[PDB]
Amino acid sequence: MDLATLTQTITFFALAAAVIIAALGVVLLDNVVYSAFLLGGVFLSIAGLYILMNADFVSAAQILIYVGAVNVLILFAIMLVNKRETYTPVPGRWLRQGGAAVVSLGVFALLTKMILQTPWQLSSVPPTPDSITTIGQHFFSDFLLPFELASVLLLMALIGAVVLARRE
Template identity: 65%
Template sequence: MNLAEGVQIVSFGLLSLMMIGAALGVVLLSNIVYSAFLLGGVFISIAGLYILLNADFVAAAQVLIYVGAVNVLILFAIMLVNKRQDFAPLPNAWVRQGATALVCAGLFVLLGTMVLATPWTTTNVLGTLPAESTIVRIGEHFFTDFLLPFELASVLLLIAMVGAIILARREFLPEETMSPEAKQQPALTLPEKPRELLTAGSDKKG
Protein backbone atom coordinates (compact mmCIF):
# COMPACT_ATOMS: atom_id res chain seq x y z
CA MET A 1 0.00 0.00 0.00
CA ASN A 2 1.52 3.25 -1.16
CA LEU A 3 0.47 5.91 1.33
CA ALA A 4 2.00 9.21 2.31
CA GLU A 5 4.41 9.10 5.19
CA GLY A 6 2.17 11.25 7.39
CA VAL A 7 -0.85 9.04 6.73
CA GLN A 8 1.18 5.95 7.58
CA ILE A 9 2.37 7.46 10.87
CA VAL A 10 -1.13 8.55 11.88
CA SER A 11 -2.62 5.19 10.89
CA PHE A 12 0.09 3.33 12.79
CA GLY A 13 -0.55 5.45 15.91
CA LEU A 14 -4.31 4.95 15.80
CA LEU A 15 -4.04 1.20 15.23
CA SER A 16 -1.45 0.89 17.99
CA LEU A 17 -3.63 2.77 20.48
CA MET A 18 -6.62 0.65 19.48
CA MET A 19 -4.65 -2.57 19.92
CA ILE A 20 -3.17 -1.58 23.30
CA GLY A 21 -6.52 -0.33 24.64
CA ALA A 22 -8.37 -3.46 23.52
CA ALA A 23 -5.65 -5.70 24.97
CA LEU A 24 -5.88 -3.91 28.32
CA GLY A 25 -9.65 -4.37 28.23
CA VAL A 26 -9.23 -8.11 27.57
CA VAL A 27 -7.03 -8.46 30.65
CA LEU A 28 -8.67 -6.02 33.06
CA LEU A 29 -12.42 -6.43 32.45
CA SER A 30 -14.22 -8.90 34.70
CA ASN A 31 -16.94 -9.71 32.15
CA ILE A 32 -15.59 -12.50 29.96
CA VAL A 33 -18.00 -11.71 27.09
CA TYR A 34 -16.69 -8.14 26.83
CA SER A 35 -13.15 -9.49 26.96
CA ALA A 36 -13.88 -11.82 24.04
CA PHE A 37 -15.32 -8.95 21.97
CA LEU A 38 -12.29 -6.78 22.72
CA LEU A 39 -10.05 -9.67 21.67
CA GLY A 40 -11.65 -9.36 18.24
CA GLY A 41 -10.69 -5.67 18.26
CA VAL A 42 -7.08 -6.66 18.97
CA PHE A 43 -7.07 -9.03 16.01
CA ILE A 44 -8.59 -6.42 13.68
CA SER A 45 -6.04 -3.78 14.69
CA ILE A 46 -3.22 -6.26 14.04
CA ALA A 47 -4.69 -6.90 10.58
CA GLY A 48 -4.56 -3.15 9.96
CA LEU A 49 -0.87 -3.13 10.87
CA TYR A 50 -0.30 -5.94 8.39
CA ILE A 51 -1.98 -3.86 5.68
CA LEU A 52 0.41 -0.99 6.42
CA LEU A 53 3.28 -3.46 5.90
CA ASN A 54 1.90 -4.48 2.46
CA ALA A 55 1.15 -7.98 3.79
CA ASP A 56 -2.34 -8.15 2.30
CA PHE A 57 -2.73 -11.92 2.46
CA VAL A 58 -1.60 -12.08 6.09
CA ALA A 59 -4.10 -9.33 6.94
CA ALA A 60 -6.93 -11.20 5.21
CA ALA A 61 -5.95 -14.44 6.93
CA GLN A 62 -5.83 -12.60 10.26
CA VAL A 63 -9.42 -11.42 9.83
CA LEU A 64 -10.75 -14.70 8.42
CA ILE A 65 -9.03 -17.10 10.81
CA TYR A 66 -8.62 -15.21 14.08
CA VAL A 67 -11.66 -12.91 13.97
CA GLY A 68 -14.01 -15.06 11.91
CA ALA A 69 -13.10 -18.44 13.41
CA VAL A 70 -11.12 -18.34 16.64
CA ASN A 71 -12.85 -15.35 18.23
CA VAL A 72 -16.32 -16.54 17.17
CA LEU A 73 -15.51 -20.00 18.57
CA ILE A 74 -14.52 -18.43 21.90
CA LEU A 75 -17.79 -16.45 21.99
CA PHE A 76 -19.84 -19.56 21.18
CA ALA A 77 -18.08 -21.52 23.91
CA ILE A 78 -18.73 -18.76 26.46
CA MET A 79 -22.39 -18.41 25.53
CA LEU A 80 -23.03 -22.16 25.40
CA VAL A 81 -21.56 -22.67 28.87
CA ASN A 82 -23.64 -19.76 30.26
CA LYS A 83 -22.34 -20.19 33.80
CA ARG A 84 -23.91 -17.44 35.87
CA GLN A 85 -21.74 -17.64 38.93
CA ASP A 86 -19.58 -14.99 40.51
CA PHE A 87 -15.92 -15.66 41.08
CA ALA A 88 -15.20 -16.64 44.67
CA PRO A 89 -12.44 -14.61 46.34
CA LEU A 90 -9.20 -16.55 46.49
CA PRO A 91 -6.83 -16.40 49.47
CA ASN A 92 -3.57 -14.56 48.81
CA ALA A 93 -4.80 -13.38 45.44
CA TRP A 94 -2.36 -10.49 45.49
CA VAL A 95 0.52 -12.96 45.07
CA ARG A 96 -0.89 -14.21 41.77
CA GLN A 97 -1.63 -10.69 40.59
CA GLY A 98 1.89 -9.55 41.48
CA ALA A 99 3.46 -12.50 39.70
CA THR A 100 1.32 -11.81 36.62
CA ALA A 101 2.35 -8.14 36.66
CA LEU A 102 6.03 -9.08 36.89
CA VAL A 103 5.77 -11.52 33.97
CA CYS A 104 3.95 -8.95 31.83
CA ALA A 105 6.50 -6.25 32.69
CA GLY A 106 9.36 -8.61 31.84
CA LEU A 107 7.82 -9.48 28.48
CA PHE A 108 7.25 -5.81 27.75
CA VAL A 109 10.87 -4.95 28.52
CA LEU A 110 12.12 -7.88 26.44
CA LEU A 111 10.00 -6.99 23.41
CA GLY A 112 10.86 -3.30 23.75
CA THR A 113 14.56 -4.12 23.81
CA MET A 114 14.19 -6.30 20.70
CA VAL A 115 12.31 -3.54 18.88
CA LEU A 116 14.98 -0.96 19.69
CA ALA A 117 17.90 -3.27 18.87
CA THR A 118 16.53 -4.62 15.56
CA PRO A 119 17.56 -2.79 12.36
CA TRP A 120 14.29 -2.16 10.54
CA THR A 121 15.73 -0.73 7.32
CA THR A 122 14.85 -2.91 4.33
CA THR A 123 16.12 -0.79 1.43
CA ASN A 124 19.18 -3.01 0.92
CA VAL A 125 17.02 -6.12 0.80
CA LEU A 126 14.15 -4.95 -1.39
CA GLY A 127 16.01 -2.46 -3.52
CA THR A 128 13.71 -0.69 -5.96
CA LEU A 129 11.36 -3.62 -6.51
CA PRO A 130 7.69 -2.67 -6.01
CA ALA A 131 5.65 -4.59 -3.46
CA GLU A 132 3.29 -6.93 -5.33
CA SER A 133 0.12 -8.53 -4.07
CA THR A 134 0.51 -12.21 -3.27
CA ILE A 135 -3.19 -13.07 -2.96
CA VAL A 136 -3.60 -13.98 -6.65
CA ARG A 137 -0.55 -16.24 -6.66
CA ILE A 138 -1.56 -17.99 -3.40
CA GLY A 139 -5.10 -18.44 -4.75
CA GLU A 140 -3.76 -20.06 -7.90
CA HIS A 141 -1.71 -22.51 -5.81
CA PHE A 142 -4.72 -23.29 -3.60
CA PHE A 143 -6.92 -24.24 -6.55
CA THR A 144 -4.25 -26.01 -8.65
CA ASP A 145 -1.34 -27.57 -6.77
CA PHE A 146 -2.94 -27.83 -3.30
CA LEU A 147 -6.58 -28.39 -4.28
CA LEU A 148 -6.98 -31.75 -2.50
CA PRO A 149 -5.62 -30.60 0.92
CA PHE A 150 -7.69 -27.42 0.62
CA GLU A 151 -10.93 -29.36 0.03
CA LEU A 152 -10.11 -31.87 2.78
CA ALA A 153 -9.64 -29.03 5.25
CA SER A 154 -13.03 -27.61 4.18
CA VAL A 155 -14.74 -30.97 4.75
CA LEU A 156 -13.07 -31.32 8.16
CA LEU A 157 -14.27 -27.87 9.23
CA LEU A 158 -17.78 -28.70 7.99
CA ILE A 159 -17.84 -31.91 10.06
CA ALA A 160 -16.69 -29.99 13.15
CA MET A 161 -19.41 -27.37 12.63
CA VAL A 162 -22.15 -29.99 12.25
CA GLY A 163 -20.92 -31.75 15.41
CA ALA A 164 -20.97 -28.48 17.35
CA ILE A 165 -24.55 -27.81 16.21
CA ILE A 166 -25.65 -31.31 17.30
CA LEU A 167 -24.02 -30.89 20.71
CA ALA A 168 -25.63 -27.48 21.16
CA ARG A 169 -29.11 -28.86 20.30
CA ARG A 170 -28.87 -32.04 22.34
CA GLU A 171 -32.23 -31.38 24.02
CA PHE A 172 -33.96 -31.99 20.66
CA LEU A 173 -32.65 -35.51 20.11
CA PRO A 174 -35.25 -38.01 18.80
CA GLU A 175 -37.12 -40.28 21.20
CA GLU A 176 -35.25 -43.39 20.05
CA THR A 177 -32.02 -42.09 21.56
CA MET A 178 -33.60 -40.93 24.83
CA SER A 179 -33.13 -42.96 27.98
CA PRO A 180 -36.13 -44.70 29.63
CA GLU A 181 -35.84 -42.38 32.64
CA ALA A 182 -36.20 -39.35 30.40
CA LYS A 183 -39.26 -40.85 28.69
CA GLN A 184 -41.00 -41.47 32.03
CA GLN A 185 -40.66 -37.85 33.16
CA PRO A 186 -44.01 -36.04 33.03
CA ALA A 187 -44.42 -33.21 30.59
CA LEU A 188 -44.54 -29.66 31.91
CA THR A 189 -48.14 -28.50 32.48
CA LEU A 190 -49.82 -25.53 34.07
CA PRO A 191 -50.47 -25.87 37.81
CA GLU A 192 -54.05 -26.87 38.62
CA LYS A 193 -56.17 -25.21 41.27
CA PRO A 194 -56.59 -27.13 44.54
CA ARG A 195 -59.76 -29.23 44.61
CA GLU A 196 -60.69 -27.99 48.08
CA LEU A 197 -60.94 -24.40 46.90
CA LEU A 198 -63.04 -25.45 43.94
CA THR A 199 -65.49 -27.39 46.10
CA ALA A 200 -65.71 -24.54 48.63
CA GLY A 201 -66.52 -22.06 45.88
CA SER A 202 -69.27 -24.25 44.46
CA ASP A 203 -70.88 -24.66 47.96
CA LYS A 204 -71.02 -20.88 48.45
CA LYS A 205 -72.72 -20.41 45.12
CA GLY A 206 -75.28 -23.09 45.97
Protein backbone atom coordinates (compact mmCIF):
# COMPACT_ATOMS: atom_id res chain seq x y z
CA MET A 1 0.00 0.00 0.00
CA ASP A 2 3.02 2.25 -0.61
CA LEU A 3 6.19 2.41 -2.70
CA ALA A 4 8.69 2.99 0.11
CA THR A 5 7.56 -0.03 2.16
CA LEU A 6 7.29 -2.14 -1.00
CA THR A 7 10.97 -1.81 -1.88
CA GLN A 8 11.86 -2.89 1.66
CA THR A 9 9.66 -5.98 1.31
CA ILE A 10 10.96 -6.99 -2.12
CA THR A 11 14.57 -6.40 -1.08
CA PHE A 12 14.04 -8.37 2.12
CA PHE A 13 12.59 -11.41 0.37
CA ALA A 14 15.25 -11.29 -2.35
CA LEU A 15 18.03 -11.14 0.24
CA ALA A 16 16.42 -13.93 2.27
CA ALA A 17 16.13 -16.18 -0.78
CA ALA A 18 19.77 -15.43 -1.60
CA VAL A 19 20.81 -16.27 1.97
CA ILE A 20 18.94 -19.58 2.02
CA ILE A 21 20.07 -20.65 -1.45
CA ALA A 22 23.69 -19.73 -0.80
CA ALA A 23 23.74 -21.48 2.59
CA LEU A 24 22.29 -24.62 1.04
CA GLY A 25 25.02 -24.22 -1.56
CA VAL A 26 27.61 -24.00 1.21
CA VAL A 27 26.30 -27.19 2.79
CA LEU A 28 25.27 -29.45 -0.13
CA LEU A 29 27.82 -28.79 -2.89
CA ASP A 30 30.61 -31.36 -3.04
CA ASN A 31 33.25 -28.81 -4.04
CA VAL A 32 34.21 -26.57 -1.14
CA VAL A 33 35.63 -23.54 -2.97
CA TYR A 34 32.19 -22.80 -4.40
CA SER A 35 30.91 -23.18 -0.85
CA ALA A 36 33.40 -20.59 0.42
CA PHE A 37 32.44 -18.03 -2.22
CA LEU A 38 28.75 -18.65 -1.59
CA LEU A 39 29.48 -18.17 2.11
CA GLY A 40 30.83 -14.73 1.24
CA GLY A 41 27.59 -14.16 -0.65
CA VAL A 42 25.62 -15.12 2.46
CA PHE A 43 27.64 -12.61 4.47
CA LEU A 44 26.93 -9.81 1.99
CA SER A 45 23.21 -10.61 1.89
CA ILE A 46 23.01 -10.61 5.68
CA ALA A 47 24.85 -7.29 5.79
CA GLY A 48 22.19 -5.99 3.42
CA LEU A 49 19.46 -7.38 5.66
CA TYR A 50 20.83 -5.55 8.69
CA ILE A 51 20.45 -2.21 6.92
CA LEU A 52 16.71 -2.80 6.70
CA MET A 53 16.81 -3.28 10.49
CA ASN A 54 18.47 0.07 11.22
CA ALA A 55 21.94 -1.41 11.84
CA ASP A 56 24.54 0.11 9.51
CA PHE A 57 27.73 0.02 11.58
CA VAL A 58 27.42 -3.70 12.30
CA SER A 59 26.57 -4.25 8.63
CA ALA A 60 29.72 -2.53 7.43
CA ALA A 61 31.64 -4.43 10.12
CA GLN A 62 30.29 -7.77 8.88
CA ILE A 63 31.38 -6.76 5.38
CA LEU A 64 34.76 -5.68 6.79
CA ILE A 65 35.59 -8.70 9.01
CA TYR A 66 33.78 -11.87 7.94
CA VAL A 67 33.86 -11.54 4.16
CA GLY A 68 36.91 -9.29 4.24
CA ALA A 69 39.17 -11.19 6.64
CA VAL A 70 37.68 -14.50 7.79
CA ASN A 71 36.53 -15.57 4.33
CA VAL A 72 39.97 -14.77 2.91
CA LEU A 73 41.45 -16.82 5.74
CA ILE A 74 39.22 -19.74 4.76
CA LEU A 75 40.21 -19.34 1.11
CA PHE A 76 43.83 -19.66 2.21
CA ALA A 77 43.26 -22.59 4.57
CA ILE A 78 41.30 -24.43 1.88
CA MET A 79 44.12 -24.52 -0.70
CA LEU A 80 46.42 -25.35 2.19
CA VAL A 81 44.55 -28.69 2.34
CA ASN A 82 43.39 -29.51 -1.22
CA LYS A 83 44.64 -32.89 -2.47
CA ARG A 84 42.06 -33.62 -5.22
CA GLU A 85 39.44 -34.52 -2.51
CA THR A 86 39.93 -38.28 -2.95
CA TYR A 87 37.24 -39.56 -0.57
CA THR A 88 35.71 -43.04 -0.87
CA PRO A 89 32.09 -43.33 0.37
CA VAL A 90 30.86 -45.03 3.53
CA PRO A 91 27.74 -47.26 3.48
CA GLY A 92 25.87 -45.03 5.92
CA ARG A 93 26.55 -41.81 4.00
CA TRP A 94 22.81 -41.42 3.48
CA LEU A 95 21.87 -42.56 7.01
CA ARG A 96 23.65 -39.77 8.90
CA GLN A 97 22.20 -37.17 6.51
CA GLY A 98 18.68 -38.44 7.10
CA GLY A 99 19.17 -38.35 10.85
CA ALA A 100 20.60 -34.84 10.75
CA ALA A 101 17.84 -33.74 8.41
CA VAL A 102 14.96 -34.90 10.56
CA VAL A 103 16.68 -33.62 13.69
CA SER A 104 17.40 -30.28 12.08
CA LEU A 105 13.92 -30.13 10.60
CA GLY A 106 12.31 -30.82 13.96
CA VAL A 107 14.25 -27.96 15.51
CA PHE A 108 13.04 -25.58 12.82
CA ALA A 109 9.42 -26.60 13.36
CA LEU A 110 9.92 -26.40 17.11
CA LEU A 111 11.44 -22.94 16.81
CA THR A 112 8.70 -21.92 14.41
CA LYS A 113 6.09 -23.12 16.89
CA MET A 114 7.62 -20.66 19.35
CA ILE A 115 8.00 -17.76 16.95
CA LEU A 116 4.30 -17.79 16.04
CA GLN A 117 2.92 -18.56 19.53
CA THR A 118 4.56 -15.98 21.79
CA PRO A 119 3.16 -12.40 22.08
CA TRP A 120 6.13 -10.19 21.21
CA GLN A 121 6.23 -6.58 22.45
CA LEU A 122 6.40 -4.61 19.22
CA SER A 123 7.14 -1.30 20.99
CA SER A 124 5.83 1.17 18.43
CA VAL A 125 8.39 3.99 18.56
CA PRO A 126 10.58 5.25 15.67
CA PRO A 127 14.12 3.89 16.14
CA THR A 128 17.18 6.12 16.37
CA PRO A 129 19.48 6.73 13.35
CA ASP A 130 22.68 7.46 15.29
CA SER A 131 23.56 3.81 15.84
CA ILE A 132 27.29 4.53 16.19
CA THR A 133 27.55 7.23 18.88
CA THR A 134 25.25 5.12 21.06
CA ILE A 135 27.50 2.07 20.74
CA GLY A 136 30.39 4.29 21.74
CA GLN A 137 28.47 5.33 24.84
CA HIS A 138 27.67 1.70 25.63
CA PHE A 139 31.28 0.55 25.32
CA PHE A 140 32.11 2.92 28.22
CA SER A 141 28.86 3.03 30.25
CA ASP A 142 27.23 -0.42 30.27
CA PHE A 143 29.32 -2.97 28.35
CA LEU A 144 32.83 -1.93 29.38
CA LEU A 145 34.02 -5.23 30.85
CA PRO A 146 33.51 -7.04 27.51
CA PHE A 147 35.51 -4.30 25.76
CA GLU A 148 38.41 -4.50 28.23
CA LEU A 149 38.26 -8.32 28.27
CA ALA A 150 37.88 -8.97 24.55
CA SER A 151 41.16 -7.07 24.41
CA VAL A 152 42.97 -9.92 26.17
CA LEU A 153 40.81 -12.41 24.26
CA LEU A 154 42.31 -11.15 21.00
CA LEU A 155 45.79 -11.14 22.52
CA MET A 156 45.41 -14.75 23.63
CA ALA A 157 43.98 -15.84 20.28
CA LEU A 158 46.93 -14.28 18.45
CA ILE A 159 49.37 -15.95 20.86
CA GLY A 160 47.60 -19.25 20.27
CA ALA A 161 47.28 -19.33 16.51
CA VAL A 162 50.82 -17.98 16.11
CA VAL A 163 52.17 -20.95 18.11
CA LEU A 164 49.80 -23.67 16.79
CA ALA A 165 50.34 -23.12 13.05
CA ARG A 166 54.06 -22.32 13.35
CA ARG A 167 56.18 -24.61 11.17
CA GLU A 168 58.63 -26.47 13.42
